[PDB]
Amino acid sequence: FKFTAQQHVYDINGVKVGGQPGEYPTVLIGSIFYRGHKIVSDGQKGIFDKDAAKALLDQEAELSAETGNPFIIDVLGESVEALTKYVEFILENTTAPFLLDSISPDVRVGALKNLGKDPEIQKRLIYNSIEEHYTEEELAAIKEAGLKTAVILAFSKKALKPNARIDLLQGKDDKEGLIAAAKRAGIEQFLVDPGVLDVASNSWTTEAINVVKEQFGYPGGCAPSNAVYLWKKMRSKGTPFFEVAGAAVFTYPITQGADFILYGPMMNAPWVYRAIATTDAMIAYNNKLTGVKMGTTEHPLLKIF
Amino acid sequence: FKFTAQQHVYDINGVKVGGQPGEYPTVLIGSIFYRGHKIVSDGQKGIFDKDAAKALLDQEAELSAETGNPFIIDVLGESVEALTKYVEFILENTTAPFLLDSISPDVRVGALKNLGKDPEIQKRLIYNSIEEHYTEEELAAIKEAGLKTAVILAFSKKALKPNARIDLLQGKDDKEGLIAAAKRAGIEQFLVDPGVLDVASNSWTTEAINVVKEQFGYPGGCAPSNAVYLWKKMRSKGTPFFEVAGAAVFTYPITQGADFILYGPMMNAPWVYRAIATTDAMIAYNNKLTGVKMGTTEHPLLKIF
Ligand SMILES: C[C@H]1CNc2nc(N)[nH]c(=O)c2N1
Ligand SMILES: C[C@H]1CNc2nc(N)[nH]c(=O)c2N1
Ligand code: NA
Ligand code: NA
């Protein structure tokens, strides 16, 4: 299958994201310094294990080289001080783009103030995320940092149907759309994430991704890890049961044309990359019947066999 | 996915198979007494550890109870003598339907002849398979046994592309095709398996399944285990990498609306059921979007969380 809209393919410091099914490999987004991450000893001051963090980043680079799946790092923090330090470390110790991420918007806003309108921030930092409850001070922070790419979290607990994402992105009635809000902040590139409520509802998330790509052509993706980790019935079963269940959840959106996955903690990268690459390879092989051309030779189909 | 044709749903000795995506859970088909199966001490005579075989069958029943995925046993043999004994064992030690499977048509036919005319065989034995090399002797043996369900296997190296596999199924030119052959044998229920040439082309396998369900409405599925076990680069990585890659392969057809998977050796059931059930749960959550109703309460969506 193909989408009618011309697909936007962004190039974020060399990472290509978007396209028609099978054109580009899935972009994989692994979390670091998340709540409970054992490499963080003090999440307020940002005391973390530099060697362990570097080893995760090097592992990510190695797996990416092996499969062809590009990576963007999801950098989480619980305080301005911590997130600032984490970002400084990531800037120095990988080349990847990264999500500036926090549960608390004020942590993201304060970290942007510290980082400043640095050209490297413009090129590599992706704001996670412009969401339903965005504030004007947030948009001001984004603009003052000169950011160009954001995740648009097109999710509303009051708007669970896929088609509603037209409404969240474009606006409806007196509500500014999330795309319009992002554009007011100077964002030019929109990674659309419809949100995941729980494992089962990943199918609605994926349907939303399909509506977005079909009608607007923005890259579409999602973050099913939190749902998977809340699935104690599976996680407690150990290896390889947790990993194959996780693989089924994380690959599902890709099978319906999604472009990127936030797969949770980076420690799971070794199995996530192997599963996702498999799915990507099968999808691109289908291109041979559809006439879609691979956009890069650095693709799982050409690498993993 | 919702398919164009009215779907055929079969009830094979209590196993429902077929339908629109999300109607019924995936049917899982595990192999026993395959070449190299270590519980078999003599594959020519069909001598095996009956307790170990029963333990596999009991595990299958337990997993099926856990997830709601029904099971059919893939009973393999390399000799008439062996396959006859295996069938007799399966008849007595489970209530499940089963595939009468051999790579050798002479073995299938000989075994089938040994089993006579038996209503229990007619209800539970699924012929694996009507394939490109069928003979009139074979069709007549099937008719004598009074079988009503067969796997219709479009695996052919002269039919690589999906449409070529559909030509093998429906007939073309001077060939009646496999469905027509099966009907001459008195088969009334068709489990269509387009074959798996290799891992990447599982997407072509799946496209063939899609065309089958689109045009004919027969249940569709496939058997990707051999392709996965021959994937040396990924198998060499060990656990859990091999299993997650396997899970990506085995779940892919289900994500595109397929009805059953022959998942390989029964010893892999514990991880296969967990992956497949996950995919099934997500698909059934889509039911409201597609206009589909669950056909049973015994579905992963209602059991695995
Ligand atoms: C748990 C929340 C946190 N932040 C998120 N960010 C993205 N991008 N996607 C999500 O689903 C979520 N979910
Ligand atoms: C090698 C063949 C043997 N028999 C089969 N039976 C089914 N059902 N599916 C297959 O792929 C195959 N492959
Ligand atoms: Na892709
Ligand atoms: Na095959």
Author numbering:
A (entry chain A), B (entry chain B): 2 to 306
Paper text:
During energy production in Desulfitobacterium hafniense, MtgA catalyzes the methyl transfer from methylcobalamin (Cbl‐CH3) to THF in the catabolism of glycine betaine (GB).
Herein, we present X‐ray structures of THF‐ and THF‐CH3‐bound MtgA that allow us atomic insights into the reaction trajectory of this catalyst. Intriguingly, the X‐ray structure of the MtgA:THF complex illustrates electron density only for the pterin moiety of the ligand; the THF tail seems to be flexible.
